[PDB]
Amino acid sequence: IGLNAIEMSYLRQSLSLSAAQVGQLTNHSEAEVLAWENAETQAPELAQKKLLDIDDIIEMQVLNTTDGIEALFKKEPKRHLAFVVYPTQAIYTQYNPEFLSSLPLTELYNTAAWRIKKECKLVLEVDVSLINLNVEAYKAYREQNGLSESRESRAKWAATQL
Template identity: 75%
Template sequence: MSKNTGLNAIEMKFLRLSLGITPAQVAELSKSTEADVMAWETGEKPVLGLAAKKLLEIDEIIEMQVLNTCDGIEALFSKEPKRQLSFVVYSNQASYAQYNPEFVGSLPLSELYNTAAWRIKKECKLVLEVEVSLVALDVEAYKAYREKEGLKESREIRAKWAATQL
């Protein structure tokens, strides 16, 4: 990828929309203002290179997660012929950060994790013919499930809990 991202106004706007984040969140990520973001997206100001670079990097991280996750799912299903999975998504930044500290640096907003989950869902359906359901984390129900089953906290346990919600 070249150092000059060269995004124009419409490309910047659609990249932001494809990530599912607001102009305020782009401003936060790029250390600018929401007014600047709106001006970039309407073409009133040239797109700040740092903002475009950050959004493109995040998009690339998400695409790598999609590829890696789909490869893992494909390998799993070559051994187990299941055709249905569930992924937990997070309704707010606090619960996302609490349950996914390993992703906070690479995907600093819960919306980005949820965007990755959505893209994984679409990719799994199209390429692997696997149905993936996105399940919103209900913290209290999840804690009750763990206590009832005597389980510790982990990503795998969240996935098992999500499967019980279908």
């Protein structure tokens, strides 16, 4: 069953995307997106699939991350954890080459992060703080601890920000 006007609008909003961003993602103009969100046209099936696929990707990330936290908790039962997020699109792109193909926009990663925070609270009773990467503080921390720039080093830094 195809997605209608309201559904496409609320799918978009659940992803923290603007209409223009959806246009860019689906190869349509902002006006075309607004039209289908106003029921003035039916969204092309490829456009629907693109947004559904992104939501599916985020959902997998939420489940996978929560599973990871749970498995780690079985060895180290810490109930306060950091999850690193990125302050701007530019820094997101610079630091996260492996998310860009499926989640090219920092808004998408932030959306996943919020959903992970919510899920961990509900299912694991773990408090996940969303920690914006502070590049200067992070660099200075790496220099003090002889760390190279990696996801693991970002995490280690983030943990000090709780």
